[PDB]
Amino acid sequence: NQYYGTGRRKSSAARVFIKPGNGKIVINQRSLEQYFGRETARMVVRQPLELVDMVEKLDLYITVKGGGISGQAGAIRHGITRALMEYDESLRSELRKAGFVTRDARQVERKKVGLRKARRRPQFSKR
Amino acid sequence: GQKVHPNGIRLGIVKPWNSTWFANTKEFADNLDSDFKVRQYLTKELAKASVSRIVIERPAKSIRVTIHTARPGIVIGKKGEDVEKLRKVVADIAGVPAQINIAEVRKPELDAKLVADSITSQLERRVMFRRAMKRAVQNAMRLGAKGIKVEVSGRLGGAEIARTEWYREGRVPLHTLRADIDYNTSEAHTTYGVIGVKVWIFKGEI
Amino acid sequence: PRRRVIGQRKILPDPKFGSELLAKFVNILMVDGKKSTAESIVYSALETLAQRSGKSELEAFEVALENVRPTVEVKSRRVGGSTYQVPVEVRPVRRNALAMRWIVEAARKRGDKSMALRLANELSDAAENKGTAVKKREDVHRMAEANKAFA
Amino acid sequence: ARIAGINIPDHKHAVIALTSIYGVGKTRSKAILAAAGIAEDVKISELSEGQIDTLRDEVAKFVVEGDLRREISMSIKRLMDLGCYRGLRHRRGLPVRGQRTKTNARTRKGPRKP
Amino acid sequence: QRIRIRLKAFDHRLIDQATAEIVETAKRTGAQVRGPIPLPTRKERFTVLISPHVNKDARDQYEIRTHLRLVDIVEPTEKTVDALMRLDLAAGVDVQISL
Amino acid sequence: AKQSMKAREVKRVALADKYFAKRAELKAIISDVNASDEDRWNAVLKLQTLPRDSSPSRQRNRCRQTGRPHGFLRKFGLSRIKVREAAMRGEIPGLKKASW
Amino acid sequence: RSLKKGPFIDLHLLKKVEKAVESGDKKPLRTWSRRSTIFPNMIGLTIAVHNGRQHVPVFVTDEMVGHKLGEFAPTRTYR
RNA sequence: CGGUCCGGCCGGGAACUCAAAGGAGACUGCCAGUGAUAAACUGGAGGAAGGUGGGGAUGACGUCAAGUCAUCAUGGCCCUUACGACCAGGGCUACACACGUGCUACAAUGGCGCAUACAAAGAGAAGCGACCUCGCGAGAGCAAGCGGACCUCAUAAAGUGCGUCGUAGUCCGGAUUGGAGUCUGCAACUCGACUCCAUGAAGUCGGAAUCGCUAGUAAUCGUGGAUCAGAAUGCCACGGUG
Ligand SMILES: [Mg+2]
Ligand SMILES: [Mg+2]
Ligand SMILES: [Mg+2]
Ligand SMILES: [Mg+2]
Ligand SMILES: [Mg+2]
Ligand SMILES: [Mg+2]
Ligand SMILES: [Mg+2]
Ligand SMILES: [Mg+2]
């Protein structure tokens, strides 16, 4: 049976299905390299496989919608770790310390009446 | 500073809507104007019937008015007569067929609208504003209000410089969304212009 | 900061070298939240500096930063109707930040063709302790040693 | 080389150099190098005299330079002689196409006088 | 085939009460029912200046939430059809049937 | 607004439904008909002899309670001021002050 | 400006141009149709084009064809 | 899992994403230090969230005869064959100037070309309008679907890839003007928006002085809405990188 983890960030949400055997990664039917043109973001999906060790140990099959580049990569990061903990849960202490268990709650702040943005205030003239 | 309308802020929380029909954008405006024309009609004809509140809903191709009144016999008239004649002209104004419901206002001195109108009508009679207010407060409390205030504004007693004045007994937590606060309004058209009356009544919480 | 003291956000390390320091650098060079394009310019400048100047990429960085790092500075102050200039001994963490910041600013105020070439030549100049950024440290000291009396 | 303008295009990429002519922006320049049979990123070098006079031939089809300037001035003169709103605007050094003058009409008005 | 009812209203507690009525009625009258499913709420919004003259930054921000329910009825057993079809439902609920 | 300004709208509404519902539609279609009467239609002339107040674009949305030609909202048929006053008394169904 | 299908002109002024043609010219023609397009059959006449307050005599000309009548009747006095 | 038009597409599956109605959860509760064994603070654990977690609504008694008689209402006053009322054209858009708020720039952290990955939130029947076809184009003809988690507006742009320009008033910038057109509308002269061709101003980072912002903020990138026949650089709202 599959071991699963949901992850989300900003307006993104990544589903993450774990199974043993290899260093394979398929996001939205596409390869890790193909999906993310940025190699840094590639590293974050790999991270949950650092403290927790996969080389050719388990398959992660994933998908995601919503948000953008780093939102989708953060969300997948998050969902993997949940799927790792699903597999043991002992692993956590490592994952906690990593900062990877937490759901980063920082959403974009709404645009408010009388202001140019969420906080940017119209330039003030004294006279 | 400016205070938020205490009926408005509590809609959905502890205060009901007075119009509660559904309608798509097509006819929402038409419905809303039709509501205005009926409330206006009824509010005039029943001016001396102590009408405190008119609920309107629109089931299917219908409209049914509920007239909350402290004087039901007046509104109804001998054996249904006055109800009926109202119905026949509501239905005209409304377009669709019409039904009228009548709900007793048991204790009007706890009804902010009839309190406010009562003071309004009293200023027009030439009663003194401190009296009228203070009768309202005293009455409201001896009947079990947790609190009440009534305000009066503009040219009290025909004074050249306009004034605002209020009295307040008991408790009126306006910042408590939980608080059953019954708030309403009335204008006194006097020989020296308009005197606005605001009224708040606290009836307990949740 | 009248009442509320704070800690400081502890940014992730540079993706390539795993350095928090270079993360402080890319961010400082970054503009309009273009992180992707910021680190591209920092590396190519480090790559230009590394390849053809004796390598040791992290160390090359330090040799240059070692030179623009300021030990003391002045903090303006208004006492009895007078704006006195009090020379303050500055703390290590910021010491790096000023050092990095003046290197970045001197790079954009340069004639070369791209920010990467500019950045590279600023580091090189700083590495040999010369150029604008080093000179920024020296003015800080000339200005500091002058008001040595009021420390 | 020189072309209908009797102007001398720079030495560097062709599609941009043709822009040097007056009455030839990018759309014409692209179309001509294409209407000739040349590559757009070629310099004057190797673009031989046989290939340059075959370009003169293609550009010859447009009114350009003195011919175009005359043609442009005369169109303005017309408005002015005609006595219409547009013409009065040209003759009064103010903007022709409706733009405000209470403030900011300054390209047309020229730098300000106190 | 199937009869599906779309329910929309401005008030939620009142909409699913009307939903509850229908489903139960169906379930009792031996109809088979898919749902009720919550279909996304379409909330209009309005921003209006709060002062009668000038003060452009002073505004009220209103919204009307429109709630949606899908009631899907598998078997149209006539008793069910009569059961449903003279139910007494909240006036402020708009009811649509698909056939 | 002025009684006379309100009256003007009603005249305009009436004319718009009388003429520029159907007759103007036909004339517009016929001016617009590419395939036929490319030269002698005369429709463009007749569209002009019609009352101006027959064109719908001549109509202006006004607060139905006061006549205000500014700050109008099609949803309610009112200006923001009367929208709010009706809103706070709870006379606009479904509507309340919203935050998010 | 106007789409190529239809050149615009007020009727009342057009018929005015007709009668002025056949019956020989008169004194100025009084018109408010600043919007109507000048036609070749106006070349010769003098149309008096309103400018808000007065009617400007305009000696129509070959080059005026296609233009608007209002283009020749300044509406704002700038001194 | 069965089936292959390799399309969740049809059987189905009800798991997961999401939808939305109800519920749990966070209280200095726990441990440690500081602090008069106090309140409180600080650090750590557990935890998605830690010290009012983040954002909003919520604005006390009152101050400024502050703003609105032009939203409406209204005391007093004033006009009434005119201060009311109808129509056409014009004006509110003027232009020696000055100030306030903005947009777009001066450029290689960039411009251009080709290719290409990832949003959120709204709007829609006198409406949103696909596909097809014609036009370089704005658009036009033809014509489905949809009162919408179904159809349409609608291809996000930043970014990444390759190539080019090589520090120049330029392959920067787009003002202004000529020519020719599109659509809305009885009607685009005064004064609409947009397109094609040509034009290519000032501007190479702004004196004195001065404003915003403490975190998913600033900065930057696109997206939608109200009003609205048409007319957004304004306003209100949305998420991307950060
Ligand atoms: Mg040129
Ligand atoms: Mg009036
Ligand atoms: Mg209009
Ligand atoms: Mg909930
Ligand atoms: Mg509070
Ligand atoms: Mg005053
Ligand atoms: Mg350009
Ligand atoms: Mg703050």
Coordinates of C-alpha atoms in Angstrom, one line a residue, chain B residues 10-190:
Chain B
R10 CA -25.0 42.5 14.1
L11 CA -26.7 41.2 11.0
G12 CA -26.2 37.4 10.8
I13 CA -24.9 37.4 14.4
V14 CA -27.8 38.2 16.7
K15 CA -30.1 40.4 14.4
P16 CA -32.3 39.2 11.6
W17 CA -32.6 40.8 8.1
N18 CA -35.8 42.6 7.5
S19 CA -35.8 41.5 3.9
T20 CA -35.1 37.8 3.4
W21 CA -36.0 36.9 -0.1
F22 CA -33.6 35.5 -2.7
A23 CA -33.2 36.9 -6.2
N24 CA -30.6 37.0 -9.0
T25 CA -29.0 40.2 -10.3
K26 CA -31.7 40.5 -13.0
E27 CA -34.5 41.4 -10.7
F28 CA -32.6 42.2 -7.4
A29 CA -32.9 45.9 -8.1
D30 CA -36.6 45.7 -9.1
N31 CA -37.4 43.7 -6.0
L32 CA -35.5 46.1 -3.8
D33 CA -37.4 49.1 -5.2
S34 CA -40.7 47.3 -4.9
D35 CA -39.8 46.6 -1.3
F36 CA -39.2 50.3 -0.8
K37 CA -42.6 51.3 -2.4
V38 CA -44.6 48.9 -0.2
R39 CA -42.7 49.8 3.0
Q40 CA -43.4 53.4 2.2
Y41 CA -47.1 52.9 1.5
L42 CA -47.7 50.8 4.6
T43 CA -45.6 53.2 6.8
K44 CA -47.9 56.1 5.9
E45 CA -51.3 54.5 6.1
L46 CA -50.5 52.9 9.5
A47 CA -48.6 55.9 10.9
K48 CA -50.9 55.8 13.9
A49 CA -51.0 52.0 14.1
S50 CA -47.6 51.8 15.9
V51 CA -45.8 49.8 13.2
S52 CA -42.3 49.1 14.4
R53 CA -41.0 46.9 11.7
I54 CA -41.9 45.4 8.3
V55 CA -40.5 42.1 7.2
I56 CA -40.8 41.2 3.5
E57 CA -40.2 37.8 1.8
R58 CA -40.9 36.6 -1.6
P59 CA -41.7 32.9 -2.0
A60 CA -41.9 31.8 -5.7
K61 CA -44.0 34.4 -7.5
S62 CA -45.4 35.9 -4.3
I63 CA -44.7 38.5 -1.6
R64 CA -45.8 38.3 2.0
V65 CA -45.5 41.3 4.3
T66 CA -45.3 40.8 8.1
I67 CA -46.3 44.0 9.9
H68 CA -44.8 44.0 13.4
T69 CA -47.3 46.2 15.3
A70 CA -48.1 47.2 18.9
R71 CA -51.7 47.9 17.7
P72 CA -52.9 44.9 15.7
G73 CA -56.6 45.6 16.0
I74 CA -56.0 49.0 14.3
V75 CA -54.0 47.5 11.4
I76 CA -56.6 44.7 11.0
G77 CA -59.8 46.9 11.4
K78 CA -63.3 45.5 11.8
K79 CA -63.4 41.8 10.7
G80 CA -60.3 41.9 8.4
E81 CA -61.4 44.9 6.4
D82 CA -58.2 47.1 6.7
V83 CA -55.9 44.1 6.3
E84 CA -57.8 43.3 3.0
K85 CA -57.6 46.8 1.5
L86 CA -53.9 46.9 2.3
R87 CA -53.4 43.5 0.6
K88 CA -55.2 44.6 -2.6
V89 CA -52.8 47.6 -3.0
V90 CA -49.7 45.9 -1.8
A91 CA -50.4 43.4 -4.6
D92 CA -50.7 46.3 -7.1
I93 CA -47.4 47.9 -6.0
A94 CA -45.7 44.5 -5.9
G95 CA -47.1 43.2 -9.2
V96 CA -47.3 39.7 -7.9
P97 CA -50.1 38.4 -5.6
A98 CA -49.8 39.4 -2.0
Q99 CA -50.5 38.2 1.6
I100 CA -50.2 40.2 4.8
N101 CA -49.1 38.8 8.2
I102 CA -49.5 40.7 11.5
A103 CA -47.2 40.2 14.5
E104 CA -47.9 41.7 17.9
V105 CA -45.3 43.9 19.5
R106 CA -46.1 42.8 23.1
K107 CA -43.9 45.4 24.9
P108 CA -43.4 48.4 22.7
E109 CA -41.4 50.3 25.4
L110 CA -38.7 47.7 24.6
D111 CA -39.1 48.3 20.8
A112 CA -36.5 50.9 19.9
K113 CA -38.5 52.0 16.8
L114 CA -41.7 52.7 18.7
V115 CA -39.7 54.3 21.5
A116 CA -38.0 56.6 18.9
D117 CA -41.3 57.4 17.2
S118 CA -43.0 58.0 20.5
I119 CA -40.5 60.7 21.4
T120 CA -40.6 62.0 17.9
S121 CA -44.4 62.4 18.1
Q122 CA -44.0 63.9 21.5
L123 CA -41.7 66.7 20.4
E124 CA -44.3 67.6 17.7
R125 CA -46.9 67.7 20.5
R126 CA -44.6 70.2 22.3
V127 CA -43.5 68.0 25.2
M128 CA -40.1 68.9 26.8
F129 CA -37.2 66.8 25.5
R130 CA -35.7 66.0 28.9
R131 CA -39.1 64.7 30.0
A132 CA -39.8 62.6 26.9
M133 CA -36.4 61.0 27.0
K134 CA -36.5 60.4 30.8
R135 CA -40.0 58.8 30.5
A136 CA -38.6 56.5 27.8
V137 CA -35.7 55.4 29.9
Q138 CA -37.6 54.9 33.1
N139 CA -40.3 52.9 31.2
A140 CA -37.7 50.8 29.4
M141 CA -36.0 49.8 32.7
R142 CA -38.9 49.1 34.9
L143 CA -39.9 46.5 32.2
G144 CA -36.5 44.7 32.3
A145 CA -34.2 46.4 29.9
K146 CA -30.5 45.7 30.8
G147 CA -29.9 49.2 29.6
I148 CA -31.1 51.9 27.3
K149 CA -30.0 55.2 26.0
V150 CA -31.9 57.7 23.9
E151 CA -30.3 60.7 22.1
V152 CA -31.9 63.8 20.8
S153 CA -30.2 66.2 18.3
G154 CA -30.7 69.6 16.8
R155 CA -32.4 72.7 18.2
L156 CA -33.9 71.3 21.4
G157 CA -36.8 73.4 22.5
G158 CA -36.4 75.6 19.5
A159 CA -32.9 76.8 20.6
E160 CA -31.1 78.8 18.0
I161 CA -27.8 76.9 18.6
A162 CA -28.5 73.2 17.9
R163 CA -27.7 70.8 20.7
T164 CA -27.3 67.0 21.2
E165 CA -28.4 65.3 24.4
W166 CA -28.9 61.8 25.6
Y167 CA -29.8 59.9 28.8
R168 CA -28.6 56.5 29.7
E169 CA -29.5 54.0 32.4
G170 CA -28.1 50.5 32.9
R171 CA -25.7 48.9 30.4
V172 CA -25.1 49.4 26.7
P173 CA -22.1 47.4 25.4
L174 CA -22.1 48.4 21.8
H175 CA -18.8 46.7 21.1
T176 CA -20.2 43.3 22.1
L177 CA -21.3 41.6 19.0
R178 CA -23.2 39.1 21.2
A179 CA -25.3 41.8 22.7
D180 CA -29.0 42.0 21.7
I181 CA -28.9 45.7 20.9
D182 CA -32.2 46.9 19.4
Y183 CA -31.3 50.2 17.6
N184 CA -33.5 52.5 15.6
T185 CA -34.3 56.0 14.5
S186 CA -36.9 58.7 14.1
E187 CA -37.0 62.4 13.0
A188 CA -39.1 65.1 14.6
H189 CA -40.2 67.7 12.0
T190 CA -40.8 70.8 14.2

